[PDB]
Amino acid sequence: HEVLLRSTETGQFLRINPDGTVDGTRDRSDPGIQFQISPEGNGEVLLRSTETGQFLRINPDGTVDGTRDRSDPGIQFQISPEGNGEVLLRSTETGQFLRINPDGTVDGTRDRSDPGIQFQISPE
């Protein structure tokens, strides 16, 4: 059971690339867009790119990348519904929200009003 993680604002899909970079794309054929939600208990999940198995990570400095460091606390997310199938994806360790910007760049923010922190999650 895989999912796609999509910007509500622009419809861009989140992608983790084999080199560990993370960005947005409209290419439905890119294998980097498929994710698996891994339950961690206590209301937390990991978001793992199925192609390479990398976990999504929000670093303290607000940068976002992919990693296999299973012990990095920046890989723990909570999925919080906003209603009507919109969600926020928040790093529990630093409180930063995942942000996909209209230019396809991806980073972390503490600005709850940013249109780029709204996501849709759809089954593959």
DSSP secondary structure, 7-64, as one string: ETTT-PEEEE-TTS-EEEE--TT-GGG-EEEEEEETTEEEEEETTT-PEEEE-TTSBE
* 111 in Cβ contact with 118 (< 8 Å): no
Domains observed in the chain: 1-124 (2.80.10.50)
* 119 in Cβ contact with 88 (< 8 Å): yes
State both tokens at 69. Answer: 């460091």
Question: Which residue has 């460091």 as its token pair?
Answer: 69
Q: How many residues does the chain have?
A: 124
**Resolution of the PDB structure in angstroms:** 1.5
Experimental method: X-ray
Query: Closest Cα partner for 14 from 54, 68, 42?
Result: 54
